[PDB]
Point group: C2
Amino acid sequence: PGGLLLGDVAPNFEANTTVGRIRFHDFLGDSWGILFSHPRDFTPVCTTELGRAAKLAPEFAKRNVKLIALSIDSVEDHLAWSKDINAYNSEEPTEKLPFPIIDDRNRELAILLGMLDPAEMPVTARVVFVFGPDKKLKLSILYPATTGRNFDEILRVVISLQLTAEKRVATPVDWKDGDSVMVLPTIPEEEAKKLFPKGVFTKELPSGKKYLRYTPQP
Amino acid sequence: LLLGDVAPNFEANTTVGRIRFHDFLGDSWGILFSHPRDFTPVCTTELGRAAKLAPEFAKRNVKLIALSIDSVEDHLAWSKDINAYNSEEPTEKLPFPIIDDRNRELAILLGMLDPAEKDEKGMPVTARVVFVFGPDKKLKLSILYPATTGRNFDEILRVVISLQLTAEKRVATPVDWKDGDSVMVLPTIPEEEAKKLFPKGVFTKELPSGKKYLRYTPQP
């Protein structure tokens, strides 16, 4: 994926965006943050992705999640590209978007974030990074520019991450919002009993270990 | 690895014998599922789902393979649990192998673990990458979900379908695309060539910029 591992604290870079200069940590503050990477402006899939992210912005904001895009082009191109994005959404073709777009025409940020090789459109600059309020990397997604992301999945994964952070539960494969969840393996039996009064169900396995524990979404 | 990076041709011991990575892949696509450790809740559910879904990937020339930081012996015992999770006879027989990375060498080589491979336990929580390689051994896509957020297999199958569509029909899939929806013509392909390549019709959505990059065409 990117050059950061899970648990890595995000680079506190300074950059100029469509809304002005920003210091990464300042911008994030006490909110979760999603950084979408794109190779260049005025490009097919990336345009459909930013238009969808713009429409979905309110769903994220109410979950204390800030959105921010990065693209390897200048701010003026970013501004012009926003009218196209707005127009694609069947909206007034304005240069205003619900989130900023960082200017990385110099490719210095793409190198910092580990999604570009100087010895090589920069097709590699495609990572979606999710950071928590603690500035650490929580999740990463690396789809090529020819495969559009699925935003219902991005939203689903955010709800999951927040569930773990606040309720101390893990979500199983293909979990849908509202489904049973799993007790964190580090939670003792004595403890899980009190923490989750709704009930903890341990699936019996051949090994006899008790790690497959389900509990209603708290 | 970055997109386009060639996979390492490592040799590893697995639940089905020793393998050489590039040999294992052959002329097929390959998805490598990483797990921090055996007998873990989320990882067990994902592996169980991968086992039930193996046929769907196989008919698509996609080979499945898992890596977990534990012994092949444990991998075998864990396989009985994985089968039991699927309510099938608890044998150590799975439709795909599990690589033994008890030593942590592969995790570091694949870049999903800081070179501190000596840590007694600690739980290799960073080793959660899903790598999708093409017949050419190059990275086509990767997903990095923590061990507390189970993967979505509908999404994984959906992306394999896009990847193969781009490889074969020279088209890209827009946001939230579902198999069967309109696709987009690669920005690379000139107007002249596209009319010939996609006889089903090409639609250029007019944008404020006058640029003609938002071109759609029925899935070919």
